[PDB]
Design an enzyme around this catalytic site. Sequence first.
Site, PDB file in Angstrom:
ATOM      1  N   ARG A 117      10.395   3.194   0.714  1.00 29.67           N
ATOM      2  CA  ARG A 117      11.669   3.687   1.253  1.00 29.67           C
ATOM      3  C   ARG A 117      12.348   4.069   0.158  1.00 29.67           C
ATOM      4  O   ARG A 117      12.095   4.024  -1.229  1.00 29.67           O
ATOM      5  CB  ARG A 117      12.298   2.485   2.120  1.00 29.67           C
ATOM      6  CG  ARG A 117      12.780   1.293   0.995  1.00 29.67           C
ATOM      7  CD  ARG A 117      13.717   0.347   1.704  1.00 29.67           C
ATOM      8  NE  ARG A 117      14.331  -0.090   0.718  1.00 29.67           N
ATOM      9  CZ  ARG A 117      14.140  -1.267  -0.101  1.00 29.67           C
ATOM     10  NH1 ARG A 117      13.060  -1.817   0.278  1.00 29.67           N
ATOM     11  NH2 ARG A 117      15.114  -1.842  -0.666  1.00 29.67           N
ATOM     12  N   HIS A 130      14.418  -7.710 -14.681  1.00 28.88           N
ATOM     13  CA  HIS A 130      13.832  -6.795 -13.644  1.00 28.88           C
ATOM     14  C   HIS A 130      14.278  -5.563 -13.883  1.00 28.88           C
ATOM     15  O   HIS A 130      15.643  -5.167 -14.156  1.00 28.88           O
ATOM     16  CB  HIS A 130      14.676  -7.178 -12.355  1.00 28.88           C
ATOM     17  CG  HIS A 130      14.455  -6.437 -11.201  1.00 28.88           C
ATOM     18  ND1 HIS A 130      14.119  -7.200  -9.978  1.00 28.88           N
ATOM     19  CD2 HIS A 130      14.501  -5.273 -10.886  1.00 28.88           C
ATOM     20  CE1 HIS A 130      13.964  -6.338  -9.091  1.00 28.88           C
ATOM     21  NE2 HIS A 130      14.073  -5.166  -9.469  1.00 28.88           N
ATOM     22  N   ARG A 158      27.921  -3.668  -7.002  1.00 25.89           N
ATOM     23  CA  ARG A 158      27.816  -4.053  -5.605  1.00 25.89           C
ATOM     24  C   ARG A 158      29.097  -4.676  -5.221  1.00 25.89           C
ATOM     25  O   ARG A 158      29.541  -5.557  -5.735  1.00 25.89           O
ATOM     26  CB  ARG A 158      26.648  -4.776  -5.135  1.00 25.89           C
ATOM     27  CG  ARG A 158      25.376  -3.971  -5.148  1.00 25.89           C
ATOM     28  CD  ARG A 158      24.270  -4.308  -4.469  1.00 25.89           C
ATOM     29  NE  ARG A 158      23.047  -4.104  -4.604  1.00 25.89           N
ATOM     30  CZ  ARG A 158      21.814  -4.336  -4.128  1.00 25.89           C
ATOM     31  NH1 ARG A 158      21.656  -4.722  -2.897  1.00 25.89           N
ATOM     32  NH2 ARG A 158      20.510  -3.850  -4.750  1.00 25.89           N
TER      33      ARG A 158
END
EC number: 6.3.4.14
Length: 447
Positions: A293, A210, A339
């Site tokens: 966004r 990714h 995260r």
Amino acid sequence: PRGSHMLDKIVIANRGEIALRILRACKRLGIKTVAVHSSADRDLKHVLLADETVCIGPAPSVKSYLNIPAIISAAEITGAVAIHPGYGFLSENANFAEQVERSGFIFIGPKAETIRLMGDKVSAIAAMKKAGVPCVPGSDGPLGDDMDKNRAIAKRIGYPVIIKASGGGMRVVRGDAELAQSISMTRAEAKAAFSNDMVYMEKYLENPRHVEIQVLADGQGNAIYLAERDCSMQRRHQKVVEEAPAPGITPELRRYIGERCAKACVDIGYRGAGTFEFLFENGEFYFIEMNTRIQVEHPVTEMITGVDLIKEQLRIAAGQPLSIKQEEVHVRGHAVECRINAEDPNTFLPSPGKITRFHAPGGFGVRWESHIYAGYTVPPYYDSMIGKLICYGENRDVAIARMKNALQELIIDGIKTNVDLQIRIMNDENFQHGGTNIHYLEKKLGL
């Protein structure tokens, strides 16, 4: 005296770490801030910091943060002239963008149409093929029973290929010798699945990564790409780690894919920030989607390139053509993001409750983005993410080295956290090497 810099006042239509992130951008540019909250986020950092606050409904997001008219009215009653959506929630809700502009307010973001366009998973594919953004080679429509052409297509895609049900939730074929039967075996599985016989085909990306590119576009003909990020470390669908720049991307390749995204923005008439998401296998990019966004992991970019993206959105929404041009954008150093979730690093489901003790990491290269603090009570409702820990280095090694140590410093007691996990990822022999795939995490863990 209104507008000693156009957008005097802004509603931050969001919460958690992003709200705070945005507020900090506004405060530092002398924009008055207007925080909209619910009675679960009554005591959020960004809310305690805002120049005004407004409660827009009960705990649940559907009644609060998804409340289009509750937000617009807040804008309406504070003399706000613009609204910042952040990410998730209404950020990519075209209806919301419309009503804000319709209601006489500037929506820091793209046009309502472009949100629909890139939100319709077929429209976007279409528009990307035209713009010339590389996509997944496919049958381009259902498969006939003409086994001559089903062979013709596969060959044109390059084996392996994957047969896919149209009303489904799929089979890989590694060559001609097994195509007819497989198409067939897939039909069977599909026939039962959702009553549908019909299936299609497209190329199989067995071990892809990714990679995603951050753009900015002024709506006025200017768009720049700001390097790219590698987001392969993923648990269920959730992005867990995000590095930038993506390891082993030659500038010739970076320049290639970026310039394409840039063009696509111009062709599509893009306005604001947005992310192009790809798979990347054998030096090729296959477009998955564009998030219309600002991106969550935007900071890793910040670190390497310098540029303030939040600061730059404001500047475009004011109607100024991009202050920056590609020839100025520069990759310096490496940045890695972990995260942080109010989760259990085993039974992977949110762990709300009071943080009895909290200490944030510090020092050179470490950046901590969080709305938490000692005494703060993580609620059960909203998303599990409680912070982003971003470490910067002169290279990938020194970065990984910093993060490993930032994570130990980090203290969050009273809830379970994904820190033990983040430490064992940064302590992965292979992740250290670089280049790991979108499957690598689930293999190291359970699933």
